[PDB]
Amino acid sequence: GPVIRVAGDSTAVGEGGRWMKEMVEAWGKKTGTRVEYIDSPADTNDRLALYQQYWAARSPDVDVYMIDVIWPGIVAPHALDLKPYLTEAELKEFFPRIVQNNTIRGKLTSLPFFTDAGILYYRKDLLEKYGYTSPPRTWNELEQMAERVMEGERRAGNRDFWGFVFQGKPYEGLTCDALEWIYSHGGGRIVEPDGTISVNNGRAALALNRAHGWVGRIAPQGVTSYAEEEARNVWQQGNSLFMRNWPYAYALGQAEGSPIRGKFGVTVLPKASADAPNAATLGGWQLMVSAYSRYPKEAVDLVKYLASYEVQKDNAVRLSRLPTRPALYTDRDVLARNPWFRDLLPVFQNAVSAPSDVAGARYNQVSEAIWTEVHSVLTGRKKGEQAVRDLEARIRRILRHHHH
Ligand SMILES: OC[C@H]1O[C@H](O[C@H]2[C@H](O)[C@@H](O)[C@@H](O)O[C@@H]2CO)[C@H](O)[C@@H](O)[C@@H]1O
């Protein structure tokens, strides 16, 4: 009978790939359907380039793809419209914001699978050791805490210890980090939902200059090459006071044999001042059935299973990744394992999207301009002032003649 082949999450990021392969294999066993799992590279933009090869070929060799929240406008032609397969009641069990994200020109490109938001990880033991009673609310406070804690830990003999790790590699994750910096300084959304390219302003320039000021100081020089896992591994070994990352790192840090089990908490990222907006970049993944699948019925059944309450529950409990079903945020077991899902739910609700809606199918080009200009600041090659000016010019060229 058919073999349903899934290009799923990466085994190179935490447990996400191993876990998803397990869920796909469980579906195959429950239904008596043969399955195969196709692994992916860690970085989202590398995944996009890989899947674009299959889509260009109209390849039947993948039935289901796990797609980024930033991709529906890019990937829609390659998606089977799921709308005819779900009832209105079924579709209302997911967050409407994500269903809307996934719907392009009325086509439901994909089912919401897990959501994501950038958050601040902090070492509670170290804050207490150095006389701090709360995590930092402003970036200045973050820098002050990091300077003091680093000085003390270095003096105590940990030469591997840093104050802050984050994603500074030139790839999509830096666009995500940089949206948080810029928005939390009151510098806007880079490209606003209305189409205005707003990034050439002094608050956005300051945000980028501030992040440059971290590199080689409170953050490793090598942060300019870090994606999610590089930052996590410094943090997880016990060697960073603070980390900016996504929800998946929490469960990994709590695993038996983690050096930092029981030593950390999470909160909203800091901001420039009390009246700036809180910033958490909206991430997350969706489940798409290929327009090129020879087995759409079976593929749809697998995607519904993966997006189901029980599978999302397992993702939450075991991998600390955020459900797309509001009902799971009140589930007793989800909450007992991850009480911060409740504490941070307003952060998740107010997360700021990258400019994928407005850029549509040109989003990857826009994002490449963003991360490259941002990276030039982090390396000390350009000042923020010049970079936001250059970035404006680039995005103007990229989006010229694009309408949304
Ligand atoms: O790097 C930007 C990318 O980060 C997040 O995606 C991660 C996800 O958190 C992990 O659990 C795992 O699935 O790997 C993904 C790719 O590194 C965001 O979800 C995504 O929106 C964002 O583009």
Short mmCIF file of all heavy atoms in Angstrom, two decimals, residues 9 13 42-44 47 66 68-70 114 116 171-173 176 228 246 248 283-285 321, ligand 1:
data_model
loop_
_atom_site.label_atom_id
_atom_site.label_comp_id
_atom_site.label_asym_id
_atom_site.label_seq_id
_atom_site.Cartn_x
_atom_site.Cartn_y
_atom_site.Cartn_z
N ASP A 9 10.75 17.78 11.09
CA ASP A 9 11.69 18.61 11.91
C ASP A 9 13.10 17.95 11.91
O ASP A 9 13.23 16.68 11.70
CB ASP A 9 11.13 18.61 13.33
CG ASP A 9 11.63 19.71 14.23
OD1 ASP A 9 12.41 20.57 13.79
OD2 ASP A 9 11.26 19.59 15.42
N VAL A 13 18.31 19.54 15.88
CA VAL A 13 17.88 20.51 16.88
C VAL A 13 17.17 19.82 18.02
O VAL A 13 16.03 19.40 17.86
CB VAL A 13 16.97 21.58 16.28
CG1 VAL A 13 16.53 22.60 17.33
CG2 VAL A 13 17.66 22.32 15.15
N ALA A 42 19.28 21.87 10.35
CA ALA A 42 18.83 22.59 11.51
C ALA A 42 18.08 23.88 11.16
O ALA A 42 17.01 24.17 11.76
CB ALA A 42 20.01 22.94 12.40
N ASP A 43 18.70 24.70 10.32
CA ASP A 43 18.28 26.07 10.13
C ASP A 43 17.09 26.13 9.18
O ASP A 43 17.08 25.59 8.09
CB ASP A 43 19.43 26.97 9.64
CG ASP A 43 20.57 27.12 10.65
OD1 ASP A 43 20.44 26.63 11.83
OD2 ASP A 43 21.62 27.73 10.17
N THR A 44 16.10 26.94 9.56
CA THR A 44 14.90 27.07 8.76
C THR A 44 15.18 27.46 7.29
O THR A 44 14.61 26.88 6.36
CB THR A 44 13.90 28.10 9.41
OG1 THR A 44 12.81 28.23 8.50
CG2 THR A 44 14.54 29.43 9.66
N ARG A 47 16.27 24.56 5.41
CA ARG A 47 15.13 23.68 5.15
C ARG A 47 14.34 24.19 3.94
O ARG A 47 13.90 23.43 3.10
CB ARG A 47 14.24 23.57 6.37
CG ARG A 47 14.95 23.03 7.60
CD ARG A 47 13.97 22.68 8.68
NE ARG A 47 14.58 22.64 9.99
CZ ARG A 47 13.94 22.39 11.12
NH1 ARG A 47 12.62 22.18 11.14
NH2 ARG A 47 14.64 22.38 12.27
N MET A 66 6.86 19.84 7.14
CA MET A 66 6.68 20.72 8.30
C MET A 66 7.25 22.08 7.90
O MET A 66 8.44 22.19 7.59
CB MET A 66 7.36 20.14 9.51
CG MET A 66 6.92 20.88 10.77
SD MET A 66 7.73 20.37 12.32
CE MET A 66 9.28 21.27 12.17
N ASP A 68 7.49 26.58 8.16
CA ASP A 68 7.70 27.66 9.13
C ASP A 68 6.56 28.62 8.99
O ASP A 68 5.93 28.70 7.94
CB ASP A 68 9.08 28.25 8.89
CG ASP A 68 9.65 29.00 10.08
OD1 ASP A 68 8.86 29.45 10.95
OD2 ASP A 68 10.90 29.24 10.05
N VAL A 69 6.28 29.32 10.09
CA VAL A 69 5.19 30.28 10.16
C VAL A 69 5.37 31.40 9.09
O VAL A 69 4.42 32.05 8.67
CB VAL A 69 5.12 30.83 11.62
CG1 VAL A 69 6.27 31.75 11.93
CG2 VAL A 69 3.76 31.56 11.85
N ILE A 70 6.61 31.64 8.73
CA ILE A 70 7.03 32.67 7.77
C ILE A 70 6.87 32.24 6.29
O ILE A 70 7.17 33.03 5.38
CB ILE A 70 8.47 33.12 8.02
CG1 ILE A 70 9.40 31.92 8.20
CG2 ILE A 70 8.59 34.06 9.25
CD1 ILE A 70 10.84 32.25 7.93
N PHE A 114 2.92 23.56 16.16
CA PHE A 114 3.34 24.25 17.41
C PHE A 114 3.65 25.67 17.15
O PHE A 114 4.09 26.03 16.07
CB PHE A 114 4.49 23.54 18.16
CG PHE A 114 5.79 23.39 17.39
CD1 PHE A 114 6.80 24.28 17.55
CD2 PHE A 114 6.00 22.29 16.54
CE1 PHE A 114 8.05 24.13 16.90
CE2 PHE A 114 7.21 22.12 15.89
CZ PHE A 114 8.24 23.04 16.08
N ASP A 116 5.63 29.34 18.87
CA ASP A 116 6.96 29.68 19.34
C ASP A 116 7.02 31.15 19.61
O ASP A 116 6.31 31.96 18.98
CB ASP A 116 8.03 29.32 18.32
CG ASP A 116 9.03 28.27 18.81
OD1 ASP A 116 9.15 27.98 20.02
OD2 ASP A 116 9.67 27.66 17.89
N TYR A 171 21.54 34.15 9.34
CA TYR A 171 20.47 33.25 8.90
C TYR A 171 19.19 33.76 9.53
O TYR A 171 19.21 34.77 10.25
CB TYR A 171 20.73 31.80 9.36
CG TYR A 171 20.38 31.50 10.80
CD1 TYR A 171 19.53 30.45 11.13
CD2 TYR A 171 20.95 32.20 11.82
CE1 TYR A 171 19.21 30.16 12.49
CE2 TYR A 171 20.60 31.98 13.15
CZ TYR A 171 19.75 30.92 13.49
OH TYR A 171 19.41 30.70 14.81
N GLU A 172 18.11 33.02 9.33
CA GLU A 172 16.81 33.53 9.75
C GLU A 172 16.73 33.79 11.22
O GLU A 172 16.01 34.74 11.64
CB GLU A 172 15.69 32.56 9.33
CG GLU A 172 14.28 32.97 9.71
CD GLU A 172 13.77 34.22 9.02
OE1 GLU A 172 14.22 34.41 7.87
OE2 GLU A 172 12.82 34.86 9.59
N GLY A 173 17.34 32.94 12.06
CA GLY A 173 17.29 33.17 13.51
C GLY A 173 17.79 34.53 13.96
O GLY A 173 17.31 35.07 14.97
N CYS A 176 14.99 36.93 13.58
CA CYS A 176 14.15 36.83 14.73
C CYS A 176 14.70 37.57 15.94
O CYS A 176 13.93 38.32 16.61
CB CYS A 176 13.85 35.38 15.08
SG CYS A 176 13.03 34.42 13.79
N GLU A 228 20.37 28.41 17.08
CA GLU A 228 19.69 27.96 18.31
C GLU A 228 20.56 27.00 19.17
O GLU A 228 20.69 27.20 20.39
CB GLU A 228 18.41 27.23 17.97
CG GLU A 228 17.26 28.19 17.60
CD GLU A 228 17.34 28.92 16.27
OE1 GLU A 228 18.14 28.54 15.37
OE2 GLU A 228 16.55 29.93 16.11
N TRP A 246 14.08 29.87 22.08
CA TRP A 246 12.71 29.45 21.97
C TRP A 246 12.42 28.46 23.11
O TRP A 246 13.34 27.91 23.74
CB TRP A 246 12.47 28.80 20.64
CG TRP A 246 12.91 29.59 19.44
CD1 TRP A 246 14.11 29.42 18.76
CD2 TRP A 246 12.23 30.64 18.79
NE1 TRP A 246 14.21 30.32 17.78
CE2 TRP A 246 13.06 31.07 17.73
CE3 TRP A 246 11.01 31.24 18.96
CZ2 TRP A 246 12.70 32.03 16.85
CZ3 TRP A 246 10.67 32.25 18.13
CH2 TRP A 246 11.51 32.65 17.06
N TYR A 248 11.66 25.28 23.19
CA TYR A 248 12.18 23.92 23.21
C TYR A 248 13.39 23.74 24.16
O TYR A 248 13.65 22.63 24.62
CB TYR A 248 12.53 23.41 21.82
CG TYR A 248 13.91 23.86 21.37
CD1 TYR A 248 15.02 23.01 21.45
CD2 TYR A 248 14.15 25.15 20.94
CE1 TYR A 248 16.30 23.40 21.10
CE2 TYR A 248 15.43 25.58 20.67
CZ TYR A 248 16.53 24.70 20.72
OH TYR A 248 17.84 25.15 20.47
N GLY A 283 7.24 32.70 16.31
CA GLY A 283 7.74 31.59 15.47
C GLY A 283 6.70 30.51 15.34
O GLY A 283 5.49 30.72 15.65
N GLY A 284 7.13 29.34 14.92
CA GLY A 284 6.32 28.15 14.99
C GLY A 284 6.23 27.44 13.64
O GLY A 284 6.66 27.97 12.60
N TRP A 285 5.72 26.22 13.70
CA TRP A 285 5.66 25.35 12.56
C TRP A 285 4.26 24.84 12.30
O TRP A 285 3.45 24.68 13.22
CB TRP A 285 6.71 24.23 12.71
CG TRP A 285 8.12 24.83 12.69
CD1 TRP A 285 8.69 25.53 13.73
CD2 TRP A 285 9.04 24.94 11.59
NE1 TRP A 285 9.94 26.02 13.35
CE2 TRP A 285 10.16 25.69 12.05
CE3 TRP A 285 9.06 24.42 10.29
CZ2 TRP A 285 11.26 25.93 11.27
CZ3 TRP A 285 10.11 24.70 9.50
CH2 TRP A 285 11.22 25.42 9.98
N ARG A 321 7.32 22.46 23.88
CA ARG A 321 6.98 23.32 22.73
C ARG A 321 5.47 23.66 22.81
O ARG A 321 4.63 22.83 23.29
CB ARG A 321 7.34 22.63 21.42
CG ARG A 321 8.86 22.50 21.30
CD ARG A 321 9.37 22.26 19.91
NE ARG A 321 8.96 20.94 19.43
CZ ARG A 321 9.41 20.40 18.34
NH1 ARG A 321 10.31 21.04 17.59
NH2 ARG A 321 8.94 19.22 17.95
O1 LIG B 1 15.83 30.18 13.52
C1 LIG B 1 14.52 30.79 13.34
C2 LIG B 1 13.40 29.78 13.60
O2 LIG B 1 13.43 29.39 14.96
C3 LIG B 1 12.36 28.56 15.41
O3 LIG B 1 12.30 27.30 14.78
C4 LIG B 1 13.01 26.22 15.40
C5 LIG B 1 12.18 25.59 16.54
O4 LIG B 1 12.05 26.44 17.69
C6 LIG B 1 12.78 24.31 17.03
O5 LIG B 1 11.92 23.66 18.00
C7 LIG B 1 13.10 23.33 15.93
O6 LIG B 1 11.94 22.92 15.35
O7 LIG B 1 13.92 24.04 14.93
C8 LIG B 1 13.37 25.20 14.34
C9 LIG B 1 14.42 25.69 13.34
O8 LIG B 1 15.66 25.97 13.99
C10 LIG B 1 11.00 29.19 15.05
O9 LIG B 1 9.95 28.28 15.30
C11 LIG B 1 10.90 29.59 13.56
O10 LIG B 1 9.66 30.28 13.35
C12 LIG B 1 12.07 30.49 13.22
O11 LIG B 1 11.99 30.85 11.84
#
